[PDB]
Amino acid sequence: TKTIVAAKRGTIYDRNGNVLAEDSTSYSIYAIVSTSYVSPTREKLYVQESQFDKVADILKDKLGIKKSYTLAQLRTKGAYQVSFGLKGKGITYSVKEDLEKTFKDAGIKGMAFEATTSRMYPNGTFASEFLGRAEPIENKKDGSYSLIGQTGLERSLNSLLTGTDGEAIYEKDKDGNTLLGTETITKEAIDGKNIYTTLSAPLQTFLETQMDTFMEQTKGINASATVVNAKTGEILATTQRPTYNSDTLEGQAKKGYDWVNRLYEAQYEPGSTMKVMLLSAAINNGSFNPNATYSNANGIKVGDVEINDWSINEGISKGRTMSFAQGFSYSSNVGMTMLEQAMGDKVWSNYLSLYKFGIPTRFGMVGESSGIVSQNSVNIAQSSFGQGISVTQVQMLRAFTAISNNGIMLEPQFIKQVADTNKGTVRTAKKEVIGKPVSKQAASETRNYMISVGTDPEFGTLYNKSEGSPIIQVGNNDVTVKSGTAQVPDEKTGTYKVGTNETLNSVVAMVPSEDPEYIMYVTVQEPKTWNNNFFATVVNPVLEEAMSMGATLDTSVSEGSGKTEETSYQTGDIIGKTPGETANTLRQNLVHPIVLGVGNKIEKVSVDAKENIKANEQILIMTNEFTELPDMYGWTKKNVETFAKWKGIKITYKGGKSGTVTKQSVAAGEALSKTKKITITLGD
Ligand SMILES: [Cl-]
């Protein structure tokens, strides 16, 4: 009868190899005292009574165990193998080796050591919710232990992190009970793969400190902050509050601790940061005249609902005439609602679809929420200022990348490299283009209008009138910013809470404004004390730290792995599986899947079950319900051809075969049943 030998679990690193989570082995000492423990020729293999006293001398000197306790245990009646309590467990490797040498030199047999593995998180309170926990779980079949990811990244990448288990034959007493430390390995375990995350430990450490200060200032019930590379979608730092120490779990049992992951599980109405998307759509639609004016004095009525600006609802002013650019700076709900009505519900609702709201990112984590998008006319209008629509933080980050990256939306990423150290192979990530909601010009103009949110002394909601300067500053750079306030729903009444500061406050910042390098998004729910100036506590120093790092944030193990052989990967049989979870799995393995349609079953895939898929290779997964033309921006020609063949559409190409789609002559969302021809422009 065999016993499983758990493989070493893979190490989780930051982007440059700083250890975030790793296995740690310690040992438990046992002594076999049964007079039945002899070889076939009756060689005594147990610890003999003539030696009990010497064992106590050794245990006292080496472990600080009182001689009388060692002696007591060694003399236990009816016992086969005995242990030695707390001092007999958690023994380091160096001490174990010393103890072994001591018994061997003293001619004492029967002492043994059983390995016990724990997961170590060296950075303590550091992206704790993101990393999650792997815990020791007992296999009820054979009594073996192995580490199993329970939450966060540990749980999400458990398949990669977990090696292939080994096998051993343990000796047993006559009662069938396993004798520990006696193993003979028969099948060697194969180590798990290492995961290099996109995180920058230095930046993350700095973010944790500033986030603690931000919580002291606001006393909010929860908060989040994430920094993203504006050009690649890589998550460089991410945290939430309240949090806990990953190594000791301290904070998890604190009053008010919230177990919900704020990056991808929590669903919320985002509020005014959504005006960034709105404004970009208005500019892209051609329905934005920055200079045209309007009045917020009477608000605006949609259906049977009244919409008003913040200053009107707080009695700051009787109303005022503003430019649309000024209303954007001022975060005027009325001005934005007017822009929404000018483009119309159908158009705006389609922009939200192009921005992928209501669709999970499937970026690699398990338990991601999808958000909620309403098709009710009142909600569509409200969504223009981020109410009546539910999102996750990661959906907002994804949308922000199109603003920061010339209209080209990117998939947020948290895995930089997956490494097989046994084989010396790796799979290294590159950016994943997933759509193009607006033009380069619309994105650029949106970013420029966002500077005024910070710089306009009269209208900017993020200008510090007391200091005569913007709240958010990063060296001498122009900073693209947008603040937000959002009404929060009440569980009792269903409707929004009315208390002072009983809101979700947030900000998005991009620096430098004209050619962004970094995006930062911060949220705080129900701050006891609030002032927009508090954002300077967390945004300013973190973005300045990011800018000061340079090649430390650009580089990773990627620079040094270009000559390293690439690990092979294949999907296996996925026809009939669920598209969502399959796409999520593929991204964990650095594949860039494109899910076609909304069905819950995979009908076709552009690569075969045993076909090798290179890192970053783009593939198509056609679901069983696919009726509308996708946004094909960034698709490879191979994928355009596969799609066209699957749906019987005639494609005319403009551009070299090596390129990816830069333009399509038929708009995304048109019925496939009426689409016979498309002109696709390729850009290499
Ligand atoms: Cl997807």
XYZ file of C-alpha atoms and ligand atoms in Angstrom:
685
model
C 0.000 0.000 0.000
C 1.391 3.380 -1.144
C 1.293 6.867 0.399
C 1.310 10.073 -1.626
C 4.419 12.272 -1.372
C 3.424 15.859 -2.107
C 5.548 17.614 -4.683
C 7.246 20.891 -3.886
C 4.794 23.690 -4.688
C 5.982 26.316 -7.135
C 7.287 29.628 -5.896
C 5.428 32.866 -6.605
C 7.738 35.740 -7.477
C 7.450 39.373 -8.320
C 8.451 40.450 -11.895
C 12.205 40.398 -11.060
C 12.392 37.235 -8.951
C 11.687 38.583 -5.440
C 10.052 35.777 -3.454
C 6.364 36.365 -2.596
C 5.354 32.822 -1.588
C 7.472 29.692 -1.235
C 7.525 26.307 0.436
C 9.337 25.825 3.730
C 10.165 22.364 5.107
C 10.607 21.654 8.795
C 10.798 18.305 10.613
C 9.128 16.329 13.373
C 11.251 13.845 15.328
C 10.009 10.341 16.222
C 11.435 7.377 18.109
C 10.425 3.786 17.363
C 10.533 1.835 20.665
C 8.649 -1.365 19.710
C 10.692 -4.506 20.372
C 8.964 -5.928 17.253
C 10.832 -3.450 15.005
C 13.614 -5.803 13.893
C 15.134 -6.868 10.563
C 14.505 -10.382 9.162
C 17.690 -11.561 11.039
C 16.452 -9.869 14.255
C 18.842 -6.920 14.101
C 17.302 -4.469 16.542
C 16.234 -1.362 14.571
C 14.451 0.295 17.519
C 15.891 2.609 20.162
C 17.018 0.335 22.999
C 16.527 1.122 26.714
C 20.319 0.994 27.231
C 20.358 4.098 24.962
C 17.294 6.012 26.336
C 19.506 8.201 28.584
C 21.918 9.136 25.771
C 18.950 10.129 23.574
C 17.766 12.423 26.405
C 21.236 14.036 26.661
C 21.127 14.644 22.920
C 17.555 16.041 22.937
C 18.362 18.346 25.874
C 21.518 19.779 24.301
C 20.032 20.055 20.754
C 16.293 20.888 21.363
C 16.146 22.042 25.002
C 13.851 19.144 25.924
C 13.959 18.128 29.615
C 15.526 14.666 30.082
C 12.571 13.490 32.177
C 10.119 14.250 29.333
C 12.210 12.440 26.671
C 12.609 9.469 29.051
C 8.861 9.468 29.871
C 7.862 9.410 26.203
C 10.452 6.776 25.271
C 9.027 4.490 28.019
C 5.326 4.905 26.964
C 3.417 1.606 27.460
C 2.087 -0.204 24.359
C 3.573 2.450 22.028
C 5.241 1.604 18.716
C 6.559 5.009 17.704
C 6.483 8.074 19.932
C 6.852 11.821 19.330
C 8.226 14.613 21.548
C 5.672 17.468 21.544
C 6.142 21.078 20.375
C 9.933 21.081 20.832
C 9.940 17.896 18.681
C 8.248 19.638 15.740
C 9.133 22.514 13.406
C 12.781 21.513 13.508
C 14.883 23.177 10.818
C 16.909 21.216 8.279
C 20.278 22.236 9.811
C 19.296 21.050 13.302
C 17.790 17.808 11.880
C 21.063 17.055 10.026
C 23.017 17.769 13.227
C 20.694 15.481 15.260
C 21.002 12.699 12.645
C 24.806 12.909 12.689
C 24.683 12.772 16.491
C 22.596 9.543 16.600
C 24.712 7.883 13.891
C 27.987 8.739 15.742
C 26.457 7.472 19.044
C 25.347 4.192 17.390
C 21.661 4.831 18.134
C 19.083 3.503 15.654
C 15.304 4.070 15.642
C 15.193 7.899 15.518
C 13.457 9.336 12.462
C 12.206 12.579 10.940
C 9.011 13.369 8.994
C 8.933 16.424 6.745
C 6.124 18.937 7.201
C 5.745 21.666 4.608
C 4.284 25.114 5.213
C 3.848 28.069 2.860
C 5.969 31.148 3.692
C 4.967 34.728 2.648
C 8.172 36.716 3.366
C 6.740 40.180 2.732
C 4.008 39.920 5.439
C 1.268 42.512 4.667
C 1.871 42.707 0.925
C -0.782 42.198 -1.810
C -2.313 39.718 0.580
C -5.750 39.358 -0.959
C -4.165 39.141 -4.432
C -1.742 36.336 -3.444
C -4.209 34.360 -1.402
C -3.232 31.355 0.731
C -2.158 27.740 0.180
C -2.836 25.613 3.281
C -1.852 22.090 4.350
C -4.709 19.668 3.628
C -4.834 16.075 4.909
C -5.564 13.357 2.345
C -8.094 11.163 4.228
C -7.158 8.092 2.118
C -3.498 7.750 3.340
C -2.924 10.513 5.945
C -0.545 12.477 3.696
C -0.404 16.262 3.596
C -0.087 18.576 0.657
C -0.408 22.312 0.167
C -3.606 23.338 -1.651
C -4.399 26.886 -2.783
C -7.558 28.093 -0.980
C -7.843 31.710 -2.099
C -6.587 34.294 -4.549
C -3.700 33.554 -6.904
C -2.705 30.432 -4.906
C -6.112 28.923 -5.667
C -6.392 30.338 -9.202
C -3.036 28.930 -10.436
C -3.194 25.816 -8.304
C -2.837 23.514 -11.344
C 0.440 25.139 -12.398
C 1.796 25.612 -8.867
C 1.115 22.026 -7.824
C 3.647 19.510 -8.967
C 3.052 15.880 -9.814
C 2.865 13.911 -6.624
C 5.392 11.238 -5.714
C 4.784 7.929 -4.010
C 6.358 6.066 -1.107
C 6.029 2.925 0.948
C 5.899 3.704 4.650
C 6.459 0.973 7.169
C 3.359 0.089 9.235
C 2.814 -1.442 12.682
C 0.753 -4.684 12.917
C -2.403 -2.485 13.323
C -1.892 -0.969 9.829
C -0.983 2.491 11.221
C 1.722 4.403 9.331
C 5.158 4.700 11.017
C 6.442 8.201 10.261
C 9.960 8.983 9.002
C 10.548 5.433 7.685
C 9.596 6.059 4.000
C 11.209 4.619 0.954
C 10.367 6.821 -2.032
C 9.305 4.696 -5.005
C 8.172 7.451 -7.373
C 9.850 10.869 -7.204
C 7.585 13.911 -7.098
C 7.933 16.529 -9.896
C 8.140 20.153 -8.660
C 5.386 22.613 -9.489
C 6.045 25.438 -11.932
C 7.168 28.816 -10.666
C 4.997 31.883 -11.336
C 6.516 35.300 -11.855
C 3.788 37.850 -11.343
C 3.775 41.293 -12.948
C 4.043 42.941 -9.514
C 6.985 45.147 -8.570
C 7.821 44.378 -4.945
C 9.414 47.824 -4.350
C 6.398 49.658 -5.759
C 3.970 47.336 -3.968
C 5.767 47.884 -0.611
C 5.544 51.611 -1.132
C 1.838 51.387 -2.075
C 1.015 49.443 1.153
C 2.564 52.181 3.294
C 0.692 54.981 1.495
C -2.559 53.035 1.539
C -2.286 52.639 5.341
C -1.925 56.411 5.653
C -4.892 56.921 3.312
C -7.056 54.642 5.505
C -5.987 56.523 8.646
C -7.118 59.770 6.977
C -10.425 58.504 5.523
C -11.481 55.750 7.975
C -13.424 54.136 5.117
C -15.009 50.705 5.466
C -12.933 49.499 2.493
C -10.559 50.759 -0.167
C -8.523 49.638 -3.147
C -5.597 50.866 -5.234
C -4.027 49.457 -8.373
C -1.196 50.629 -10.620
C -1.108 49.411 -14.247
C 1.389 49.808 -17.071
C -0.519 51.982 -19.545
C 1.155 50.451 -22.570
C 1.045 46.747 -21.611
C -1.846 46.191 -19.199
C 0.508 44.639 -16.603
C -0.617 45.022 -12.987
C 2.428 46.516 -11.200
C 0.879 46.895 -7.782
C -2.477 46.120 -6.226
C -3.901 46.281 -2.751
C -7.072 46.537 -0.732
C -8.104 47.489 2.751
C -8.804 46.140 5.216
C -6.053 43.571 4.748
C -4.046 40.954 6.623
C -0.471 39.718 7.090
C -0.097 36.822 4.606
C 2.501 34.961 6.679
C 0.680 35.133 10.062
C -2.987 35.761 9.047
C -3.153 38.613 11.540
C -5.996 40.968 10.560
C -8.336 38.297 9.148
C -10.088 37.942 12.514
C -10.339 41.725 13.001
C -13.754 43.368 13.277
C -14.741 44.786 9.906
C -12.482 42.508 7.874
C -14.081 41.970 4.444
C -13.330 38.731 2.604
C -14.465 40.031 -0.821
C -11.680 40.528 -3.379
C -11.858 44.133 -4.531
C -9.946 43.602 -7.757
C -12.286 41.078 -9.396
C -15.128 39.892 -7.114
C -16.740 43.029 -5.711
C -19.455 44.546 -7.967
C -20.243 48.227 -7.514
C -21.641 51.313 -9.206
C -18.428 53.129 -10.205
C -19.759 56.675 -10.328
C -18.102 59.545 -12.206
C -14.919 57.846 -13.461
C -17.347 56.341 -15.983
C -17.575 59.868 -17.509
C -14.128 59.132 -19.012
C -15.734 56.427 -21.167
C -18.737 58.711 -21.847
C -16.626 61.631 -22.969
C -14.472 59.402 -25.206
C -17.631 58.061 -26.869
C -19.067 61.547 -27.385
C -15.806 62.661 -29.017
C -15.601 59.479 -31.113
C -19.300 59.826 -32.160
C -18.647 63.373 -33.407
C -21.277 64.679 -30.934
C -19.051 66.778 -28.665
C -18.714 70.528 -29.054
C -16.435 71.532 -26.128
C -17.560 75.176 -26.289
C -21.342 74.688 -26.495
C -22.980 75.670 -23.232
C -25.825 74.478 -21.044
C -27.412 75.197 -17.669
C -27.522 72.787 -14.709
C -30.011 75.028 -12.859
C -33.087 72.841 -13.384
C -31.301 69.525 -13.694
C -32.526 67.146 -16.360
C -35.404 64.689 -16.348
C -35.214 61.183 -17.834
C -38.368 59.086 -17.666
C -39.776 59.783 -14.198
C -36.326 60.423 -12.627
C -34.674 63.789 -11.804
C -30.914 64.228 -12.408
C -28.997 67.065 -10.719
C -25.402 68.204 -10.190
C -23.523 67.738 -6.898
C -23.423 71.455 -6.064
C -27.219 71.759 -6.571
C -27.917 68.732 -4.343
C -25.638 70.288 -1.661
C -26.929 73.875 -2.034
C -23.560 75.325 -3.077
C -25.091 77.197 -6.056
C -28.472 78.063 -7.582
C -27.146 76.845 -10.957
C -24.723 78.035 -13.642
C -24.027 78.083 -17.385
C -21.007 76.020 -18.443
C -19.047 74.806 -21.410
C -19.242 70.983 -21.867
C -15.488 70.827 -21.195
C -16.069 72.771 -17.976
C -18.972 70.500 -16.989
C -16.617 67.542 -17.489
C -14.037 69.233 -15.261
C -16.802 70.001 -12.769
C -18.149 66.442 -12.921
C -21.604 67.691 -13.957
C -24.092 64.781 -14.165
C -26.439 67.048 -16.162
C -23.795 67.913 -18.756
C -22.861 64.260 -19.168
C -26.491 63.133 -19.347
C -26.999 65.736 -22.115
C -24.035 64.220 -24.029
C -25.601 60.754 -23.597
C -28.939 62.000 -25.003
C -27.148 63.690 -27.947
C -25.548 60.434 -29.048
C -28.667 58.470 -28.003
C -29.324 55.343 -25.920
C -28.582 52.851 -28.698
C -25.175 54.397 -29.467
C -24.142 54.818 -25.808
C -25.265 51.279 -24.957
C -23.139 49.980 -27.862
C -20.080 51.922 -26.549
C -20.505 50.213 -23.174
C -20.592 46.919 -25.064
C -17.384 47.849 -26.994
C -15.822 48.715 -23.606
C -17.024 45.200 -22.545
C -18.989 46.140 -19.450
C -21.143 43.235 -18.275
C -18.514 40.761 -19.566
C -15.886 39.334 -17.206
C -12.252 39.892 -18.182
C -11.419 36.175 -17.679
C -7.924 37.443 -16.899
C -6.902 34.341 -14.949
C -8.477 34.459 -11.520
C -11.222 32.089 -10.386
C -14.417 33.585 -8.872
C -14.473 36.730 -11.010
C -17.819 38.616 -11.141
C -19.372 39.827 -14.414
C -20.971 43.096 -13.371
C -24.551 44.040 -14.354
C -25.581 46.158 -17.335
C -29.207 47.227 -17.673
C -31.123 47.842 -20.862
C -33.722 50.057 -19.092
C -33.765 53.612 -20.578
C -33.376 55.246 -17.155
C -30.310 53.105 -16.266
C -28.727 53.787 -19.698
C -28.906 57.561 -19.007
C -27.637 57.158 -15.430
C -24.767 54.964 -16.640
C -23.351 58.122 -18.301
C -22.222 59.149 -14.779
C -21.707 55.569 -13.579
C -24.955 54.830 -11.756
C -27.455 52.100 -12.664
C -24.550 49.965 -13.883
C -22.374 47.534 -11.892
C -18.710 46.845 -12.594
C -15.657 45.193 -11.066
C -12.395 47.063 -10.543
C -10.694 44.953 -13.196
C -13.434 45.901 -15.766
C -12.671 49.557 -15.060
C -8.924 48.944 -15.462
C -9.519 47.188 -18.774
C -11.626 50.139 -20.038
C -9.012 52.644 -18.862
C -6.335 50.943 -20.977
C -8.117 52.057 -24.196
C -7.939 55.653 -22.986
C -4.228 55.315 -22.067
C -3.217 53.268 -25.136
C -4.443 55.247 -28.216
C -7.942 53.744 -28.166
C -6.633 50.128 -28.126
C -8.000 48.122 -25.225
C -5.715 45.649 -23.457
C -6.394 42.666 -21.229
C -5.159 43.326 -17.680
C -2.377 40.832 -16.783
C -0.888 39.614 -13.529
C 1.349 36.756 -14.860
C 4.695 37.660 -16.396
C 6.211 34.207 -16.753
C 5.482 30.567 -15.942
C 8.729 28.616 -15.475
C 9.535 24.939 -15.395
C 12.845 24.925 -13.480
C 13.195 21.162 -13.791
C 13.242 21.379 -17.609
C 14.727 24.822 -17.986
C 11.826 26.118 -20.060
C 9.557 29.140 -19.764
C 6.461 30.802 -21.208
C 6.711 34.596 -21.070
C 3.821 37.076 -21.468
C 3.333 39.921 -23.919
C 0.421 42.378 -24.144
C -2.998 41.177 -25.316
C -5.009 43.532 -27.574
C -8.726 42.821 -27.147
C -10.555 45.664 -28.899
C -10.722 49.272 -29.978
C -13.683 51.148 -28.512
C -12.586 54.650 -29.691
C -10.133 56.292 -32.064
C -6.622 57.426 -31.172
C -7.754 61.048 -31.544
C -10.781 60.549 -29.233
C -8.578 58.939 -26.567
C -5.992 61.718 -26.836
C -8.601 64.494 -26.612
C -10.250 62.763 -23.656
C -6.862 62.697 -21.846
C -6.310 66.390 -22.558
C -9.796 67.342 -21.228
C -8.935 65.283 -18.115
C -5.942 67.571 -17.347
C -8.418 70.378 -16.569
C -10.169 68.278 -13.943
C -6.941 68.866 -12.002
C -5.827 72.300 -13.310
C -8.994 74.442 -13.724
C -9.134 76.724 -10.636
C -12.798 77.499 -11.164
C -14.294 74.204 -12.365
C -11.813 71.385 -11.692
C -13.000 69.001 -8.978
C -9.390 67.939 -8.396
C -7.835 71.432 -8.121
C -6.698 72.383 -4.606
C -8.007 75.928 -4.146
C -6.262 76.252 -0.761
C -2.816 75.664 -2.362
C -3.478 77.164 -5.798
C -2.498 73.933 -7.564
C -3.740 70.496 -8.641
C -4.367 67.902 -5.934
C -2.655 65.227 -8.021
C 0.916 66.060 -8.968
C 3.721 63.847 -10.323
C 6.970 65.842 -10.577
C 6.355 68.543 -13.219
C 4.231 66.308 -15.506
C 0.760 67.053 -16.786
C -1.540 64.494 -15.180
C -4.736 63.157 -16.725
C -7.257 62.690 -13.923
C -10.948 62.106 -13.203
C -12.558 61.845 -9.825
C -15.659 60.072 -8.905
C -18.343 59.904 -6.285
C -20.962 57.204 -6.447
C -24.167 56.720 -4.595
C -24.147 53.425 -2.653
C -27.176 51.075 -2.476
C -28.648 50.155 0.906
C -29.644 46.513 1.528
C -32.549 47.395 3.829
C -34.277 49.975 1.587
C -32.775 48.802 -1.748
C -32.402 52.478 -2.730
C -29.282 54.609 -2.247
C -27.971 55.559 1.227
C -28.413 59.227 2.196
C -25.817 59.748 4.976
C -22.994 62.296 4.695
C -19.974 60.789 2.873
C -21.941 57.519 2.528
C -20.510 57.215 -0.968
C -17.914 55.436 -3.013
C -15.116 57.892 -3.798
C -12.578 57.220 -6.527
C -9.990 58.580 -8.894
C -8.211 57.493 -12.058
C -4.873 59.088 -12.957
C -2.606 58.690 -15.991
C 0.880 60.085 -16.297
C 2.344 61.602 -18.318
C -0.872 62.863 -19.902
C 0.033 62.981 -23.570
C 1.883 59.610 -23.771
C 0.848 57.658 -20.630
C 3.243 55.255 -18.895
C 1.168 54.416 -15.821
C -2.498 54.285 -14.812
C -3.562 54.342 -11.169
C -7.077 53.708 -9.829
C -8.080 54.289 -6.211
C -11.384 53.748 -4.412
C -12.633 54.202 -0.838
C -16.132 53.302 0.335
C -17.964 55.315 3.004
C -15.106 57.416 4.358
C -15.956 58.847 7.828
C -13.856 61.899 6.943
C -13.513 63.031 3.318
C -11.806 65.643 1.186
C -10.564 65.201 -2.402
C -7.136 66.323 -1.160
C -6.785 62.910 0.495
C -6.108 61.337 -2.905
C -2.733 63.112 -2.893
C -1.732 60.859 -0.001
C -1.847 57.749 -2.192
C -1.703 58.788 -5.871
C 1.125 61.390 -5.864
C 3.932 59.503 -4.122
C 3.095 56.123 -5.731
C 3.088 57.493 -9.293
C 6.266 59.475 -8.540
C 7.868 56.270 -7.228
C 6.754 54.434 -10.385
C 8.237 57.119 -12.632
C 11.501 57.185 -10.636
C 12.017 53.396 -11.123
C 12.418 53.336 -14.931
C 14.010 50.113 -16.202
C 13.128 48.329 -12.940
C 9.411 48.383 -13.877
C 9.923 47.838 -17.637
C 12.214 44.834 -17.157
C 11.451 41.465 -15.664
C 12.776 37.904 -16.096
C 11.648 38.413 -19.769
C 14.992 40.204 -20.367
C 17.210 37.126 -19.941
C 14.630 34.490 -21.027
C 14.484 35.287 -24.804
C 17.110 32.578 -25.472
C 15.379 30.130 -23.085
C 13.481 27.281 -24.728
C 9.705 27.739 -24.591
C 7.512 25.271 -22.639
C 5.019 23.452 -24.853
C 1.248 23.738 -24.182
C -1.889 22.228 -25.740
C -5.561 22.742 -24.881
C -6.574 19.117 -24.763
C -10.242 18.294 -25.621
C -12.279 21.439 -24.931
C -15.274 21.043 -27.306
C -18.421 20.957 -25.159
C -16.684 22.713 -22.212
C -17.754 26.100 -20.818
C -16.110 28.996 -22.750
C -15.605 31.253 -19.723
C -13.615 28.923 -17.469
C -11.688 27.595 -20.484
C -10.652 31.122 -21.552
C -9.541 31.816 -17.970
C -7.413 28.608 -17.964
C -5.867 29.469 -21.333
C -4.717 32.898 -20.029
C -3.098 31.223 -16.999
C -1.021 29.415 -19.613
C -0.316 32.655 -21.478
C -2.566 31.945 -24.459
C -4.663 34.892 -25.778
C -8.126 33.482 -26.441
C -10.943 35.322 -28.212
C -14.401 34.058 -27.205
C -16.934 34.453 -30.024
C -20.538 34.880 -28.958
C -22.490 34.353 -25.743
C -23.290 30.622 -25.598
C -22.360 28.461 -22.611
C -20.672 25.727 -24.717
C -17.574 25.588 -26.886
C -18.610 24.535 -30.423
C -15.354 25.129 -32.358
C -11.762 26.137 -31.671
C -9.194 27.514 -34.173
C -6.507 25.062 -32.967
C -6.754 21.315 -32.358
C -6.655 19.460 -29.018
C -3.019 18.337 -29.441
C -1.787 21.351 -31.334
C 1.017 23.230 -29.582
C 0.042 26.775 -28.642
C 2.946 29.211 -28.214
C 3.022 31.786 -25.466
C 0.825 34.755 -26.464
C -0.672 32.937 -29.417
C -4.144 34.251 -30.282
C -6.840 31.623 -30.800
C -10.585 31.648 -31.473
C -13.160 29.863 -29.297
C -16.545 29.882 -31.045
C -19.410 29.340 -28.625
C -22.733 27.747 -29.502
C -24.500 31.165 -29.650
C -22.715 33.517 -32.042
C -24.782 35.889 -34.199
C -23.107 39.354 -34.201
C -19.892 40.562 -35.866
C -17.098 41.037 -33.316
C -14.766 44.015 -32.845
C -11.930 42.383 -34.771
C -9.251 44.956 -33.959
C -5.916 43.221 -33.340
C -6.951 39.830 -34.801
C -4.318 37.927 -36.756
C -5.047 37.266 -40.433
C -5.129 33.510 -39.657
C -7.963 34.163 -37.213
C -9.857 36.445 -39.601
C -9.599 33.615 -42.207
C -10.759 30.935 -39.759
C -13.712 33.064 -38.671
C -14.660 33.835 -42.260
C -14.558 30.177 -43.204
C -16.670 29.217 -40.143
C -19.358 31.800 -40.956
C -19.127 31.849 -44.768
C -18.155 35.505 -45.103
C -16.078 36.788 -48.035
C -13.090 38.838 -46.836
C -11.172 41.374 -48.907
C -7.774 42.279 -47.411
C -5.851 45.522 -47.524
C -2.261 45.197 -46.227
C 0.498 42.626 -45.749
C -0.341 39.082 -44.590
C 1.920 39.375 -41.503
C -0.284 42.011 -39.877
C -3.206 42.222 -37.549
C -6.520 43.930 -38.138
C -6.510 47.740 -37.854
C -9.878 48.477 -39.535
C -13.062 46.623 -40.545
C -15.604 47.955 -43.095
C -18.594 46.521 -41.199
C -19.149 47.699 -37.606
C -18.985 45.329 -34.650
C -22.430 44.110 -33.591
C -24.019 43.830 -37.061
C -25.938 40.605 -37.666
C -23.765 37.817 -39.137
C -26.836 36.580 -41.082
C -26.770 39.734 -43.225
C -22.976 40.147 -43.415
C -21.668 38.634 -46.687
C -18.540 40.694 -47.259
C -16.058 42.634 -45.173
C -13.013 44.662 -46.115
C -10.349 44.113 -43.468
C -7.306 46.360 -43.227
C -4.174 44.735 -41.796
C -1.305 46.645 -40.130
C 2.018 44.833 -39.570
Cl -12.298 36.221 -22.850
